[PDB]
Design a protein around this motif. Structure first.
Motif, PDB file in Angstrom:
ATOM      1  N   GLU A 286     -19.178 -53.969 -30.831  1.00 42.72           N
ATOM      2  CA  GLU A 286     -20.573 -54.158 -30.427  1.00 42.72           C
ATOM      3  C   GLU A 286     -21.454 -53.068 -31.016  1.00 42.72           C
ATOM      4  O   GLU A 286     -22.250 -53.353 -31.909  1.00 42.72           O
ATOM      5  CB  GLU A 286     -20.695 -54.203 -28.896  1.00 42.72           C
TER       6      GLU A 286
ATOM      7  N   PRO B 131     -20.489 -50.184 -32.955  1.00 44.19           N
ATOM      8  CA  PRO B 131     -20.289 -49.795 -34.371  1.00 44.19           C
ATOM      9  C   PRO B 131     -21.027 -50.708 -35.351  1.00 44.19           C
ATOM     10  O   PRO B 131     -21.503 -50.261 -36.393  1.00 44.19           O
ATOM     11  CB  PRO B 131     -18.771 -49.893 -34.550  1.00 44.19           C
ATOM     12  N   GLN B 132     -21.120 -51.994 -34.960  1.00 48.89           N
ATOM     13  CA  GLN B 132     -21.756 -53.101 -35.653  1.00 48.89           C
ATOM     14  C   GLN B 132     -23.277 -52.956 -35.675  1.00 48.89           C
ATOM     15  O   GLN B 132     -23.904 -53.439 -36.609  1.00 48.89           O
ATOM     16  CB  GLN B 132     -21.307 -54.436 -35.024  1.00 48.89           C
ATOM     17  N   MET B 133     -23.864 -52.271 -34.669  1.00 49.27           N
ATOM     18  CA  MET B 133     -25.308 -52.002 -34.575  1.00 49.27           C
ATOM     19  C   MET B 133     -25.649 -50.779 -35.400  1.00 49.27           C
ATOM     20  O   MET B 133     -26.605 -50.823 -36.162  1.00 49.27           O
ATOM     21  CB  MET B 133     -25.723 -51.685 -33.140  1.00 49.27           C
TER      22      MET B 133
ATOM     23  N   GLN C 128     -24.132 -49.518 -37.861  1.00 49.27           N
ATOM     24  CA  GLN C 128     -23.961 -49.932 -39.254  1.00 49.27           C
ATOM     25  C   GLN C 128     -25.229 -50.647 -39.729  1.00 49.27           C
ATOM     26  O   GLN C 128     -25.790 -50.266 -40.757  1.00 49.27           O
ATOM     27  CB  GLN C 128     -22.735 -50.850 -39.372  1.00 49.27           C
ATOM     28  N   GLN C 129     -25.721 -51.623 -38.930  1.00 46.68           N
ATOM     29  CA  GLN C 129     -26.943 -52.394 -39.196  1.00 46.68           C
ATOM     30  C   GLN C 129     -28.201 -51.543 -39.356  1.00 46.68           C
ATOM     31  O   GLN C 129     -29.180 -52.032 -39.910  1.00 46.68           O
ATOM     32  CB  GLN C 129     -27.181 -53.442 -38.111  1.00 46.68           C
TER      33      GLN C 129
ATOM     34  N   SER D 161     -28.973 -51.279 -42.953  1.00 48.17           N
ATOM     35  CA  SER D 161     -29.269 -52.578 -43.561  1.00 48.17           C
ATOM     36  C   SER D 161     -30.607 -52.657 -44.283  1.00 48.17           C
ATOM     37  O   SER D 161     -31.628 -52.241 -43.722  1.00 48.17           O
ATOM     38  CB  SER D 161     -29.167 -53.702 -42.532  1.00 48.17           C
TER      39      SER D 161
ATOM     40  N   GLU E  33     -32.622 -57.308 -39.382  1.00 51.45           N
ATOM     41  CA  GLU E  33     -31.315 -56.841 -38.935  1.00 51.45           C
ATOM     42  C   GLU E  33     -31.440 -55.437 -38.347  1.00 51.45           C
ATOM     43  O   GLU E  33     -30.919 -55.195 -37.257  1.00 51.45           O
ATOM     44  CB  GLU E  33     -30.281 -56.858 -40.085  1.00 51.45           C
TER      45      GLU E  33
ATOM     46  N   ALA F 222     -31.016 -54.466 -34.183  1.00 55.90           N
ATOM     47  CA  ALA F 222     -30.007 -53.487 -33.765  1.00 55.90           C
ATOM     48  C   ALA F 222     -30.672 -52.265 -33.112  1.00 55.90           C
ATOM     49  O   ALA F 222     -30.162 -51.758 -32.116  1.00 55.90           O
ATOM     50  CB  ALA F 222     -29.145 -53.066 -34.946  1.00 55.90           C
TER      51      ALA F 222
ATOM     52  N   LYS G 293     -31.786 -53.228 -29.777  1.00 59.64           N
ATOM     53  CA  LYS G 293     -30.575 -53.320 -28.952  1.00 59.64           C
ATOM     54  C   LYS G 293     -30.113 -51.915 -28.502  1.00 59.64           C
ATOM     55  O   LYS G 293     -29.905 -51.702 -27.309  1.00 59.64           O
ATOM     56  CB  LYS G 293     -29.441 -54.057 -29.692  1.00 59.64           C
TER      57      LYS G 293
ATOM     58  N   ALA H 170     -20.724 -43.603 -30.912  1.00 56.52           N
ATOM     59  CA  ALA H 170     -20.734 -44.635 -31.954  1.00 56.52           C
ATOM     60  C   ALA H 170     -21.438 -44.158 -33.244  1.00 56.52           C
ATOM     61  O   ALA H 170     -21.427 -44.881 -34.240  1.00 56.52           O
ATOM     62  CB  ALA H 170     -21.383 -45.909 -31.430  1.00 56.52           C
TER      63      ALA H 170
END
Ligand SMILES: [Ca+2]
Length: 280
Positions: free
Chosen positions: A1, A3-5, A7-8, A11, A16, A20, A23, A41
């Motif tokens: 959840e 790590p994926q944000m 990273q974004q 972007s 994107e 994030a 979020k 994170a």
């Protein structure tokens, strides 16, 4: 959840990035345990980069996210400091964008809402000169945020209180006690009483600034909170040496304090007696 944000946040897609960011800010707004999960994170180095963005939308969200992170505990404030937030935040105090300045001032005040080590980091970054300039602002909202941030700086140890003094904040605070606006008086007196919580060197710097004549005048204020805050500064400068205690006596406080003993509000009745017994 998460790590994926985090990273974004790198972007090239602005939708994107924003999604994030929006979020991470809402997830960090929550619990203190939630603030740590966001920290762990690795969101912090990514967020600090975004403070340099010319995009107001992505900067506004990034700021919200950092002030919400700095909403946490003392060693989570330190993570924000270690990430290198402060220089970017201090840079933003020169902003003509009232919303960006409001957010940046909020985040710095939240960083200054910790221990002396954290408070010193803010001083070290050079926030005080910018903060003092802002006390000469005609904007009552900017004045409030700057006074909030300064009060938080002046909450710390003697090294931090003397920092504010050396930053030339006292003439500005003294000049503000002559305000017709009772809400400015509440914030100027609040900051001034924190300067007055210090040691003999700090107590005297307040005295030399011409603070006492304005405080003794404000002891006959019809606003219960401003009168209470005048007592605050006095009972705080009463803590200092006999040399300082004398300067207070020759300010004409003695009689005003003797009068305040018999007040309608029992809260200021004790606040006046405590000030009297610590004066003689
Ligand atoms: Ca733009």
């Amino acid at each position: 959840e998460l790590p994926q944000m985090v990273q974004q946040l790198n972007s090239p897609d602005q939708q994107e990035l924003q999604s994030a960011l929006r979020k991470l800010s809402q997830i960090a707004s929550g619990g203190n345990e939630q603030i740590q999960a966001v920290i762990d994170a690795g969101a912090l180095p990514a967020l600090v980069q975004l403070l340099s963005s010319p995009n107001e939308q992505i900067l506004q969200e990034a700021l919200w996210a950092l002030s919400n992170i700095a909403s946490g505990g003392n060693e989570q404030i330190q993570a924000v400091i270690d990430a290198g937030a402060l220089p970017a935040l201090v840079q933003l105090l020169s902003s003509p964008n009232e919303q960006i300045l409001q957010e940046a001032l909020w985040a710095l005040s939240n960083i200054a809402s910790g221990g002396n080590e954290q408070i010193q980091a803010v001083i070290d970054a050079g926030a005080l000169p910018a903060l003092v300039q802002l006390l000469s602002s005609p904007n009552e909202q900017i004045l409030q945020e700057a006074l909030w941030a300064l009060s938080n700086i002046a909450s710390g140890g003697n090294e931090q209180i003397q920092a504010v003094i050396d930053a030339g904040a006292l003439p500005a605070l003294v000049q503000l006690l002559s305000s017709p606006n009772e809400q400015i008086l509440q914030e100027a007196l609040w900051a001034l009483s924190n300067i007055a919580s210090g040691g003999n060197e700090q107590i005297q710097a307040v005295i030399d600034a011409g603070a006492l004549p304005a405080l003794v005048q404000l002891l006959s204020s019809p606003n219960e909170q401003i009168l209470q805050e005048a007592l605050w500064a006095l009972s705080n400068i009463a803590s200092g040496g006999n040399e300082q205690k004398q300067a207070v006596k020759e300010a004409g406080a003695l009689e005003k304090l003797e009068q305040l003993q018999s007040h309608e509000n029992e809260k200021i009745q004790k606040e006046a007696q405590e000030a009297l017994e610590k004066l003689q």
